[PDB]
From a paper:
The two genome segments code for four viral proteins, the nucleoprotein (NP), the glycoprotein-precursor, the small matrix protein Z and the large > 200 kDa L protein which harbors the viral RNA-dependent RNA polymerase. The L protein synthesizes two distinct RNA species: (i) the antigenomic and genomic RNA as products of genome replication and (ii) the shorter capped viral mRNAs during transcription. To initiate viral transcription, the L protein presumably uses a process called cap-snatching. It is assumed that the L protein cleaves host cell mRNAs downstream of the 5'-cap structure and uses this short capped RNA as a primer for viral mRNA synthesis. Here we present the crystal structures of the two terminal domains of the CASV L protein: the cap-snatching endonuclease in the N-terminus and the 326 C-terminal residues, which, by analogy to LASV, might play a role in transcription.
Optimization of expressed fragments using bioinformatics, limited proteolysis, and thermal stability assays led to the C-terminal 326 amino acids of the CASV L protein (residues 1721–2046; residue numbering refers to the full-length L protein) with N-terminal His-tag as best candidate for structure determination. After His-tag cleavage, the purified seleno-methionine-labelled protein was successfully crystallized and the structure was solved using the single anomalous dispersion method. The protein (called CASV L-Cterm) crystallized in space group P212121 with two molecules per asymmetric unit and the structure could be refined to a resolution of 2 Å. The protein crystallized as a dimer, which is not fully symmetric. The protein monomer is U-shaped and consists of two separate domains, (i) a mainly α-helical domain (domain 1) composed of residues 1721–1793 and 1894–2046 with a long C-terminal tail and (ii) a domain (domain 2) consisting of a large β-sheet as well as one long and two short α-helices (residues 1794–1894) (blue and green respectively). The second domain is inserted into the sequence of the first one and both domains are connected by two long flexible linkers with barely any additional contacts. In the crystallized dimer the two U-shaped monomers interlock with each other to form a ring with a hole in the middle with a buried surface area of approximately 3000 Å2 between the monomers. Most importantly, the highest degree of similarity was seen between the L-Cterm domain 2 and the PB2 cap-binding domain. Domain 2 of L-Cterm also contains an aromatic residue (Y1872) at the end of the homologous long helix pointing in the same direction as the F404 in PB2. In conclusion, L-Cterm domain 2 is structurally similar to the PB2 cap-binding domain, although the typical aromatic sandwich for cap-binding is not complete.
Author numbering:
A (entry chain A): 2, 1721 to 2046
B (entry chain B): 1 to 2, 1721 to 2046
């Protein structure tokens, strides 16, 4: 592998060790991971690799950092003249009548962004804007700059220009003040705070992908329903972060045979975190009465207004009865 | 009245709309005829400083007196190879239809020189497909290695991107035009002397242009006989496909059916040549010549090119009232 791959593997090893074992993010954790995932490139090449998050913390420890990771040390205003564009559908090609665009300041952490969700409804456009930002920012001034970038990048700027700051929902994140953090279930728990900071789960290679799936199930299998009832909300939310990332990796059949949803203690997770999970293929509902359900516009059941039907594994005698149509 | 750009927008809308019934060479008389019903309010002095591209610029230039017709390739620009544009649809934490895709390109390049990396979760991790959209004669490998470093630096150096070798990349080389005049027909440019087309943004997002587009399409197909359709070049059929698909994305399933384009002889001959599966605003329909109108349905007892479908039916309340509300 390369230095990039090695850095990835060390980061995967920490994420993976956090599934069963909370650990303080400090140099000896990286030292202990290095036993299984050594770093064999030279420190000089490491300096050319520009990273953030735990990747960058690992990089710094390999370069000699001895201090523990401090919550909020990555805070960046960003470049207020460089912008990232995220889009979900377009005006030319909406997704089920919707298109969403998020423009953000490049390299801001927490990210400062204006998201505008839009929809064609008789006989105009309905817009919803959310400014996700940080306490103390100049919210009206950030909205206007970002709105201007929305007008310049939009294939339909007429619908944007009428959105006023009074219509915007604001969400403010706070920067940490250097608290040390515990890594557990791919999430940072800053000492003294009650919230968590979910971390990205890599595990893009064969071994780490399979071990991620197996450790999640092992984590849940080793909790009784009463254990789960005793978990604080912050730990429930971190578990939710790993659970949802794992289900995104499965199609419907693989998610079902994975069988996490069959564990008695996972049913307690479902009651506390929700029953609705996105897979690679679609949306499933792990229902306690009806079993596995699959989102289905033509379904004859509704779970919290989502129409669903019973999910069914493909069976060769049934597939053989499907009428294959002439083209 | 509307600003100088909203004016251009409406004039461009008007050209696209005029291209539905007949092909139109892109030349000043086309613009002038559009100005009869969509007149340009603002002063030409404002218009001098607006930054536009594509057809909206050619409209601008014609407003400023240009007598020459539009020339294919006249917009070529190698772009700024020190400055980069960054967009993405989907992320590893919220994939869109199972994928996430990132595109990084050279600022102001036309054709756009870009590296797109699309990824999905598969067994054993992540699969990637990379596409370098570029121009004949570029240094493809150097562009790739430059844009790949950007991707790594933009994505927090995921191991899956670093694994992508130049030999894994699909290279799509666009041709630059050579000054050919161009015909606009069904929202697509046909450069004379070339066999390819360039689909254009269709626009028409206001209420009146939406309805006009829908009306003009049905009329354009009505104006054709089945024999007419069987004589059209593949170029013209692809342009028609462009407009048909944009229109069905504007309907829910019920409105798509009462729109009734699918019921026309000449459209059935179109279906035979472009396919029967059309995404709508609501789901997906199959306009079948034997079974009738079908609708995507994972429970379907029929499959059309592997899509499971059922027969379409109007929403009724005695099916609705029986929907079982589930315990939370
Ligand atoms: Cl058939």
């Amino acid at each position: 592998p390369t230095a990039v791959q090695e850095l990835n593997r060390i980061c995967d090893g920490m994420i993976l060790s956090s599934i069963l074992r909370p650990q303080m993010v400090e140099p000896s954790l990286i030292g202990d991971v290095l036993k299984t995932e050594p770093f064999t490139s030279s420190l000089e090449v490491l300096k050319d690799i520009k990273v953030s998050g735990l990747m960058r913390y690992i990089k710094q420890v390999l370069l000699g950092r001895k201090s523990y990771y401090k919550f909020g040390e990555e805070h960046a205003d960003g470049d207020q003249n460089l912008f990232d564009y995220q889009f979900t559908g377009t005006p030319e090609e909406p997704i089920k009548g919707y298109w969403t665009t998020t423009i953000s300041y490049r390299d801001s952490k927490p990210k400062i962004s204006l998201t505008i969700r839009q929809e064609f409804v008789e006989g105009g456009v309905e817009s919803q804007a959310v400014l996700a930002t940080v306490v103390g920012r100049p919210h009206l001034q950030d909205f206007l700059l970002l709105k201007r970038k929305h007008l310049e990048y939009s294939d339909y700027p007429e619908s944007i220009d009428l959105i006023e700051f009074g219509d915007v929902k604001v969400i403010e994140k706070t920067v940490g003040h250097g608290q040390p953090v515990v890594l557990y279930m791919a999430s940072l728990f800053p000492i003294g705070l009650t919230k968590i900071a979910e971390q990205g789960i890599g595990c893009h290679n064969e071994k780490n992908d399979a071990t991620l799936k197996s450790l999640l199930k092992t984590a849940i299998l080793n909790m009784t329903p009463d254990d789960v009832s005793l978990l604080p909300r912050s730990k429930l939310d971190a578990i939710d972060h790993v659970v949802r990332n794992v289900y995104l990796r499965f199609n419907n059949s693989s998610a079902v045979s994975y069988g996490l949803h069959k564990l008695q203690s996972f049913e307690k997770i479902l009651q506390l975190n929700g029953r609705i999970y996105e897979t690679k293929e679609s949306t499933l509902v792990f229902h306690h009465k009806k079993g596995v359900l699959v989102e289905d516009l033509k379904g004859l059941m509704s779970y919290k207004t989502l129409r669903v039907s019973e999910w069914r594994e493909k069976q060769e005698p049934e597939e053989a009865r499907v009428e294959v149509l002439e083209e």
